[PDB]
Design an enzyme around this catalytic site. Structure first.
Site, PDB file in Angstrom:
ATOM      1  N   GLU A  21       0.806  -1.224   0.000  1.00 32.31           N
ATOM      2  CA  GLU A  21       0.000   0.000   0.000  1.00 32.31           C
ATOM      3  C   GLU A  21       0.844   1.281   0.000  1.00 32.31           C
ATOM      4  O   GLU A  21       1.926   1.327   0.590  1.00 32.31           O
ATOM      5  CB  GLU A  21      -0.960   0.026   1.199  1.00 32.31           C
ATOM      6  CG  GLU A  21      -1.997  -1.090   1.220  1.00 32.31           C
ATOM      7  CD  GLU A  21      -3.105  -0.897   0.196  1.00 32.31           C
ATOM      8  OE1 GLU A  21      -3.730   0.187   0.196  1.00 32.31           O
ATOM      9  OE2 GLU A  21      -3.355  -1.828  -0.599  1.00 32.31           O
ATOM     10  N   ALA A  23       1.022   5.528   1.099  1.00 35.60           N
ATOM     11  CA  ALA A  23       1.307   6.640   0.163  1.00 35.60           C
ATOM     12  C   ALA A  23       0.142   7.099  -0.730  1.00 35.60           C
ATOM     13  O   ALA A  23      -0.446   8.151  -0.482  1.00 35.60           O
ATOM     14  CB  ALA A  23       2.625   6.447  -0.629  1.00 35.60           C
ATOM     15  N   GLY A  25      -2.117   4.454  -2.181  1.00 35.54           N
ATOM     16  CA  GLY A  25      -3.072   3.367  -2.164  1.00 35.54           C
ATOM     17  C   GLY A  25      -2.409   2.078  -2.599  1.00 35.54           C
ATOM     18  O   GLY A  25      -1.253   1.831  -2.264  1.00 35.54           O
ATOM     19  N   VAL A  27      -0.422  -0.700  -4.546  1.00 39.20           N
ATOM     20  CA  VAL A  27       0.647  -0.862  -5.529  1.00 39.20           C
ATOM     21  C   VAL A  27       0.752  -2.324  -5.961  1.00 39.20           C
ATOM     22  O   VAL A  27       0.888  -3.224  -5.131  1.00 39.20           O
ATOM     23  CB  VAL A  27       2.012  -0.379  -4.996  1.00 39.20           C
ATOM     24  CG1 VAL A  27       3.079  -0.518  -6.072  1.00 39.20           C
ATOM     25  CG2 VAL A  27       1.917   1.069  -4.523  1.00 39.20           C
ATOM     26  N   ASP A 137      10.502  15.277   1.301  1.00 35.74           N
ATOM     27  CA  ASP A 137      10.176  14.034   2.000  1.00 35.74           C
ATOM     28  C   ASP A 137      11.164  12.896   1.731  1.00 35.74           C
ATOM     29  O   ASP A 137      10.761  11.744   1.547  1.00 35.74           O
ATOM     30  CB  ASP A 137       8.744  13.589   1.681  1.00 35.74           C
ATOM     31  CG  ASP A 137       8.207  12.580   2.689  1.00 35.74           C
ATOM     32  OD1 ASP A 137       8.606  12.645   3.873  1.00 35.74           O
ATOM     33  OD2 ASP A 137       7.395  11.716   2.296  1.00 35.74           O
TER      34      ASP A 137
HETATM   35  C1  36O Z   1       6.715   0.944  -4.664  1.00 38.96           C
HETATM   36  N1  36O Z   1       7.169  -0.291  -4.551  1.00 38.96           N
HETATM   37  C2  36O Z   1       7.864  -0.863  -5.529  1.00 38.96           C
HETATM   38  N2  36O Z   1       8.341  -2.155  -5.406  1.00 38.96           N
HETATM   39  C3  36O Z   1       8.506  -2.742  -4.075  1.00 38.96           C
HETATM   40  C4  36O Z   1       8.755  -4.244  -4.201  1.00 38.96           C
HETATM   41  C5  36O Z   1       8.905  -4.842  -2.801  1.00 38.96           C
HETATM   42  C6  36O Z   1      10.097  -4.193  -2.098  1.00 38.96           C
HETATM   43  C7  36O Z   1       9.871  -2.683  -1.987  1.00 38.96           C
HETATM   44  C8  36O Z   1       9.705  -2.090  -3.386  1.00 38.96           C
HETATM   45  C9  36O Z   1       8.107  -0.126  -6.696  1.00 38.96           C
HETATM   46  N3  36O Z   1       8.756  -0.378  -7.858  1.00 38.96           N
HETATM   47  C10 36O Z   1       8.683   0.673  -8.619  1.00 38.96           C
HETATM   48  N4  36O Z   1       7.984   1.662  -8.000  1.00 38.96           N
HETATM   49  C11 36O Z   1       7.604   1.183  -6.772  1.00 38.96           C
HETATM   50  N5  36O Z   1       6.921   1.673  -5.741  1.00 38.96           N
END
Ligand code: 36O
Length: 337
Positions: A21, A23, A25, A27, A137
């Site tokens: 989630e 931030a 919503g 992902v 941030d």
């Molecule tokens: C958030 N999370 C992601 N991937 C995660 C995968 C799990 C470990 C933490 C990072 C992303 N990849 C590109 N933009 C993102 N925004």
């Protein structure tokens, strides 16, 4: 069709897999059928809050405008064909393997890794600042890593031009000026954040982990020592400033006592980043040119922005309905056709 929530991005993007989630919503990772690679997709549903609309537009315009190895880009944006139907916006980005937050929870970083990660953060930040933008941030979870140790700065929803009271996930990385609600802070707040990140890379724990508002400041004072009247030069609340000036005197704690195994050049730079006085605080180019980063520093290979970033019309004054129109316009280039 994921966690009981709608995620309509097909048919180009299939095989949705829940990541976590925001931030913003939900992902997800998804399979890009056109580019034959897996990507990350952020679902955003901001149109009922004026400040969420600000954050979303800010995010989109800035990332679409910036071009830099150390800053996440936007590959694609999904939304409804008509503005009336547009309730959600889906932002597609390269899939990153992890972030500094998770990494620091499980891994010990060699001095060479700390030095290179730091270099990449400052290299990206140099570009940001050169566009006359403050990130505002910076924190470990906004620093994404791939499989080959490439670092990218993320989430520019809180970024403004260099000319709140809302919820954020953590305040452990905010400069004292920000904590003290000053009105007139500069690029130096970002440098403070990076210093906090540097300290955490050196020890695997946050350097200023306050439990609550006033506790956050006590942690800072307990290490940097009591601030002087001169250090407190920002336009801040008179009573808050007096309170702070009346706290029990703390002596500065030497860095090598907190970090007895850290590179001594790293601690010298750390010292320059975590200064209470913003005007005394080191700037991004100066930090880059610090002896600690000498093996990576190369001003001929550190791109700056083609021109200072400028929202030609200011955002915080627009009704949420007008912000939605701008969001519709900024994303229309990704529509077929
Ligand atoms: C958030 N999370 C992601 N991937 C995660 C995968 C799990 C470990 C933490 C990072 C992303 N990849 C590109 N933009 C993102 N925004």
């Amino acid at each position: 069709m994921v966690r009981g929530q709608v995620f309509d991005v097909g048919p180009r993007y299939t095989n949705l897999s829940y990541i976590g989630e925001g931030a913003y919503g939900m992902v997800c990772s998804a399979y890009d059928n056109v580019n034959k690679v897996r990507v990350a997709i952020k679902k955003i549903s901001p149109f009922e809050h004026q400040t969420y609309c600000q954050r979303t537009l800010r995010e989109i315009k800035i990332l679409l405008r910036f071009r830099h190895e150390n800053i996440i880009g936007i590959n694609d944006i999904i939304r409804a064909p008509t503005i009336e139907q547009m309730k959600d916006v889906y932002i597609v980005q390269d899939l990153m393997e992890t972030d500094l937050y998770k990494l620091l929870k499980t891994q010990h970083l060699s001095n060479d890794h700390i030095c290179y990660f730091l270099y990449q953060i400052l290299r990206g930040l140099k570009y940001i600042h050169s566009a006359n933008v403050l990130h505002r941030d910076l924190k470990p979870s906004n620093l994404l890593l791939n499989t080959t140790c490439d670092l990218k700065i993320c989430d520019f929803g809180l970024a403004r031009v260099a000319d709140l009271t809302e919820y954020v996930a953590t305040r452990w990385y905010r400069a004292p000026e920000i904590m003290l609600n000053s009105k007139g802070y500069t690029k130096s707040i970002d440098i403070w954040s990076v210093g906090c990140i540097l300290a955490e890379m050196l020890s695997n724990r946050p350097i200023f982990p306050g439990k609550h508002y006033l506790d956050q400041l006590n942690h800072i004072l307990g290490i940097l020592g009591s601030p002087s009247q001169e250090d407190l030069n920002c336009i801040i609340n008179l009573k808050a400033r007096n309170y702070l000036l009346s706290l029990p005197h703390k002596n500065k704690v030497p860095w090598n006592r907190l970090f007895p195994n850290a590179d001594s050049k790293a601690l010298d730079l750390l010292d320059k980043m975590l200064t209470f006085n913003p005007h005394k605080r080191i700037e991004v180019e100066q930090a880059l040119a610090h002896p600690y980063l000498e093996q990576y520093y190369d001003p001929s290979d550190e791109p700056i922005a083609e021109a200072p970033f400028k929202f030609d019309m200011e955002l915080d004054d627009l009704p949420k309905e007008k912000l939605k129109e701008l969001i519709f316009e900024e994303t229309a280039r990704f529509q077929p056709g």
